[PDB]
């Protein structure tokens, strides 16, 4: 192991990402991209310039779990291959903001039952599983949450350390 992981998380910022469906998280896992609404896009872009690592922790609504976490490797950008998200009905892809490139750090799941002892001071100390899409997670909460995930032996953090 967890040492390179701890190095990546040192002084990171953490954001809760809530997805309405598994297909979008699977797309993000396969393509290494994420997109969010502009209010969250601006917060993530500000954070990306401000911190060594900005970590997105993903949870699909009604799943009762986190599905993994990833590190921003770029600010948002527009143009390029349109990502075929499953949009929330109404659902203009034009309503989305730009595309963030992300490097996955752990693609394994963690059930909420394992994070019930972690509260997020930036969301009224509610359990860290609770929060709107884009909710920032305080440093210590976010670090301990990431350390709870089962190690993902498929990922080599040597590559993402060099991007810091």
From Swiss-Prot:
The chain holds residues 345 to 507 of 727 of the full protein. Changing residue 59 to A: Does not affect ability to influence alternative splice site selection. Residues 12-149 form the YTH domain. Changing residue 132 to D: Does not affect ability to influence alternative splice site selection. It comes from Homo sapiens. Changing residue 104 to D: Does not affect ability to influence alternative splice site selection. Coiled coil: none annotated. It is found in: Nucleus; Nucleus speckle. This is YTH domain-containing protein 1. The gene is YTHDC1. Changing residue 24 to D: Abolished binding to N6-methyladenosine (m6A)-containing RNAs. RNA binds at residues 18-20, 34-35, 85, 133. Changing residue 34 to D: Abolishes RNA-binding and ability to influence alternative splice site selection. Tyrosine phosphorylated.
């Amino acid at each position: 192991g967890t040492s390179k992981l701890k190095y990546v998380l040192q002084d990171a910022r953490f954001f809760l990402i809530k997805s309405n469906n598994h297909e979008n998280v699977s797309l993000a896992k396969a393509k290494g991209v994420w997109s969010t609404l502009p209010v969250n896009e601006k917060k993530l872009n500000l954070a990306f310039r401000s911190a060594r690592s900005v970590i997105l922790i993903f949870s699909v609504r009604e799943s009762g779990k986190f599905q993994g976490f990833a590190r921003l490797s770029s600010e948002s950008h527009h143009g390029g291959s349109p990502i075929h998200w499953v949009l929330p009905a109404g659902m203009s892809a034009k309503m989305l903001g730009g595309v963030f490139k992300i490097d996955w750090i752990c693609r394994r799941e963690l059930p909420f039952t394992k994070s019930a002892h972690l509260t997020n001071p930036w969301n009224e100390h509610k359990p860290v599983k609770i929060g709107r899409d884009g909710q920032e997670i305080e440093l210590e909460c976010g670090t301990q949450l990431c350390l709870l995930f089962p190690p993902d032996e498929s990922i080599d953090l040597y590559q993402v350390i060099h991007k810091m």
